[PDB]
Amino acid sequence: TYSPLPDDYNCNVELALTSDGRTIVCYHPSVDIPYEHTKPIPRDQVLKTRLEEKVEHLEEGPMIEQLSKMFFTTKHRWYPHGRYHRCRKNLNPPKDR
Amino acid sequence: FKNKTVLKKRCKDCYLVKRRGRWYVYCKTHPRHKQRQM
Amino acid sequence: VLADLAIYEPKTFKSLAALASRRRHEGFAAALGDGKEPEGIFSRVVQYH
Amino acid sequence: GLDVIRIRKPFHTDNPSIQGQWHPFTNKPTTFRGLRPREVQ
Amino acid sequence: SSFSRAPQQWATFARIWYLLDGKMQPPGKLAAMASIRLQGLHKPVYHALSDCGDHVVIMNTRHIAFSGNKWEQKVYSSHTGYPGGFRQVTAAQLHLRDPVAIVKLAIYGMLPKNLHRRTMMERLHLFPDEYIPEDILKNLVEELPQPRKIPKRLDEYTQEEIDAFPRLWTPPEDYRL
Amino acid sequence: MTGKELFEMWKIINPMGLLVEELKKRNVSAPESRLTRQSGGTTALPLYFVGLYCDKKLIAEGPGETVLVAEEEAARVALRKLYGFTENRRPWNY
Amino acid sequence: SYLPGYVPKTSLSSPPWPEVVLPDPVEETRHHAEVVKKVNEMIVTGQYGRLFAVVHFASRQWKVTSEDLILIGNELDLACGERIRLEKVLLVGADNFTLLGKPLLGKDLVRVEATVIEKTESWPRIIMRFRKRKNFKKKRIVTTPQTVLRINSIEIAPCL
RNA sequence: GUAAAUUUAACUGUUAGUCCAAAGAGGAACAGCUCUUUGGACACUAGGAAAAAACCUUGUAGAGAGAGUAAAAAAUUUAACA
Ligand SMILES: [Mg+2]
Ligand SMILES: [Zn+2]
């Protein structure tokens, strides 16, 4: 009836001590999300259905505040950078795993 | 009112009341005894 | 390695957090008891010599 | 044969997580029917 | 987890839209927990260069509560830099002018003083009443618990706890009350 | 072979089709996709955790920026789990 | 009848934290025996894969796995490509279970096997001292020795 | 308890000094004032008191993606009198 932590989000943590008392055994099986707790997946007569390719060219300003409103940032991220920094950038960075 | 740091009764009818966070001596018969703590 | 287990191995970190919370509860129980009750299963001290 | 230059991160594993790398929904409980907070349903 | 690399990175570094309520909560405690979530200091993958902030949606900002007399004592000072731009307004005056300015300024003060503060402020969303826009409501995950406990006024005590609490003193029968 | 993923080494086109073929060939009911977890949704940066179930029992879960790619990642996770090519599988004995 | 020491329920009559009762020792030791045993037959059967360990080595603690690389900041008096056993295993574990030493696990319980695969030196490190208006300027170059070990295998044995 | 001291030989350089604690003198029982004495620190490192010479902690030098610590965060809310 006692649990050190709530047992319903990550794993079913059960603690134990060995008979000698020299080591601690932890058993942690994963908790699976219930089906009841889930949610189902959300779902011209005469001419072509012509593809709707309009690309309005917004000027630099209203373009930048549209991007800022879309990505919840400021304008400074979208303003450009000079040749000094652009050539200072490493275009072949090291890559681990 | 006269501004004082220590407040004294100069009459038997003088009374002390704490109003607006400050102590006051009010006298109805001798209004010259009106005193305000600083 | 505690931060490493926190980032990559959340089940082992939850086991460690449960162990720490149980040790804290055992310490609280010993402090309130204040007598000569059994020391606790996880409060036992392994001695070296 | 590798370069004697600065080595970042003095350990290289290719399987850094075995129990699943942490995401925000780890250590997060589920709700009945997956309801959002203050969902009128 | 056996995810592919790009979905695993996306899952690890995705953003969460936490919900927070005003309604007799202290603005400082609201600001503290909101600033932790906005910095992303609640994540074990936190780093200042990792851009791991999360969105915080605070509602009922008009119904905040101040401990003590801070509604009159606390003074917010600004300066429009023309000679004489020094304006000082009490917390009450600032709240009656703008209902979200107090919590906004508290979170802004608690956020770290660098160039990421305005981006975290952009990720913070505040609303004065129960109304929240539908897109944000569809974004919301995890209403966080309130710091205070709503000290529960006398008239909504139930009769069970009222007569479970014993009476302390016996009044005399000859008192007007 | 040591440090690469199964679908990094063997490219596949329809993981959902492969998964339903395997489930029908080992006599398991067809998987149902469900939205286990969801953050955002109206923003440009959503997160969908889509879980694949059979007989109301979870067999896979996958993250994505859209529901469709989350579903395909869940299908790939199910294929990896059924094949034994999971990331936590026993490493090669030398 | 109120006990002599009863306090009416106020906001701070009782401590704010919830009351926590610990399990009785005998049933808890029996539960520990059940958990330790069942984890031991999981080890016996082999219901695990891709073990990890936290190992103390060269005054550091490394979270290593199989097929791993570590860089030790000193020479190790070993030839290249040489198999050794890391023994001071603070922690070992896998999926669904882990084992914790107090502070060290048993050598009969866990082994770590590593291979000396490289004996190199670091990139040159600048040590420079400067104090102004006192003509104080000193420069030194060091190259600390280094040894790259590859963690081959982590093996556990049924001894719980 | 410790390992320095004296002598012999050869010389340079320092000999325009600041704060703090203490005992005093001058001045106003003024001064980041002036003058002696005892002792610190600074004119050499690092951490702290917000920035910081002089206060506190600490000294002997390198690498570490280890650990235990040192000094180290100001508290206060006052007037009824027959
Ligand atoms: Mg002087
Ligand atoms: Zn009078």
XYZ file of C-alpha atoms in Angstrom, chain E residues 28 37 39 55 79 82 90 104 109 122 124 128 141 156-157 172:
16
model
C 5.545 36.260 -7.768
C 8.987 26.771 -17.698
C 13.633 29.090 -19.547
C 4.995 28.085 -23.945
C 10.720 57.114 -17.480
C 11.854 63.647 -22.115
C 1.074 52.057 -7.643
C 4.166 40.424 -17.205
C 12.126 40.637 -13.966
C 7.188 36.164 -26.920
C 4.701 33.729 -22.813
C -6.953 38.661 -18.000
C -1.187 20.575 -22.378
C -18.800 27.801 1.872
C -17.753 25.607 4.796
C -23.048 34.293 29.160
